[PDB]
């Protein structure tokens, strides 16, 4: 019953565009909105998230996320290994991808979501998020090599996932970061879980 | 090691602006991003809120409070948790438990409200905080939760038990064409990883 009528661009850059979205409400009244979307996505979503779980025996088990400066937010953000798919590469690859180039992580898929929304009400963006696991015994993982692409500087900070949202408190609490929403979601529902 | 040094607009809309933004990156070399940021924000300590909704009710499997609503930057029908911005001078707290009264009538409990996370941090500075309350199913109040929508407002509520929420879910996107919201669809993944 609501559905898209035309979009207005406002301004393009060369990785993010503003366009004014005209749209029929459920009453039959005609209203805008203003959305953002990249400009990179050719591609079943923009990106992928990569939800890592390492497992070492005889250690807690492990969600591996990464710390980066974020020139949106000015500031240094908490996240899942994440990164845009590239034109003809599938959302999987994507994933084993991001994680080894950010991590240096070798690792193997268990799922992956569907497309999801990143902020619906602000922009089109998606990404999968993909479910990943890390034998953190086999010697390919012993040293695991983080490779930084152009102008990337990420670093690793793995937390036990048993703890995991009093860990990421403490994080913010003593080093003023940002813990990403998703990040947090499932920090929360690991809690919430029973 | 990183830092900004300059943000100058290139578009300001009415509620979204899009800026290019100037940092210092690690190697001590200047670098410029784009950034997306809303208009909206003054001294709230994020942009909005999202609410988790327990939905608890005496020989009730413990249900999660969705909603579902079309979403102009989508184009198309989104599945989130209840949330809005936060109004000026409100609480995170108050906007939630204003947030979830509005979109799904339901008079809910604050549980724990989390600090500030970032939205899609390599996108936009947008926050929210994610308030985690719960809602006494057995009270008269939340018999026949009435949703007050506002002007272009119109919100269908989808109650989902926890034990099942992933599965769920993925029966939701198997039956008809729509979006699950990636702070959702993590916090179902937490809920089969624990
Ligand atoms: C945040 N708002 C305004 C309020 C009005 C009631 O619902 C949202 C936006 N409105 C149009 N285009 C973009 C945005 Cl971000
Ligand atoms: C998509 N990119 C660059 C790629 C290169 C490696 O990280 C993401 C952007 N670059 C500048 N401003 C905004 C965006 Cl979104
Ligand atoms: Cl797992
Ligand atoms: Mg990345
Ligand atoms: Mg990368
Ligand atoms: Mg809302
Ligand atoms: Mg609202």
Redesign the interface.
């Known amino acids: 019953k ?3 009528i035309s979009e207005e661009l ?2 393009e ?4 565009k ?1 366009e ?2 005209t ?1 029929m ?2 009453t039959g009244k005609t ?1 805008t ?6 400009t990179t996505r050719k591609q079943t979503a923009d990106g992928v ?1 990569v ?1 890592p ?1 390492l497992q070492r025996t005889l250690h807690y088990e492990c969600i591996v996320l990464v710390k980066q ?6 500031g ?2 908490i ?1 899942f290994p994440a990164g845009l798919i590239d034109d003809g590469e599938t959302p999987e690859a994507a994933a084993l991808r991001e994680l080894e180039e950010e991590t240096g992580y070798k690792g193997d898929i268990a799922e992956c ?15 999968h ?1 993909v ?1 990943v696991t890390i034998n953190g015994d086999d010697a390919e993982n012993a040293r695991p090599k983080p490779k930084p692409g152009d ?1 990337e ?1 990420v670093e690793v900070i793995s937390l036990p ?1 048993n703890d995991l949202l009093q860990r990421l ?1 403490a994080l ?1 609490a003593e080093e003023h970061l ?13 809690k ?3």
């Open positions: 609501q559905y898209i406002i301004s850059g060369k990785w993010v503003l004014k979205t749209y409400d459920p209203r909105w203003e959305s953002v979307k990249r998230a939800i779980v400066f974020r020139p949106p937010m000015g240094y953000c996240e979501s569907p497309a999801v929304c990143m902020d619906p009400g602000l922009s089109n963006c998606t990404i998020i479910t102008g500087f996932k408190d913010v940002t813990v990403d929403a998703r990040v947090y979601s499932y920090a929360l529902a690991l919430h879980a029973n």
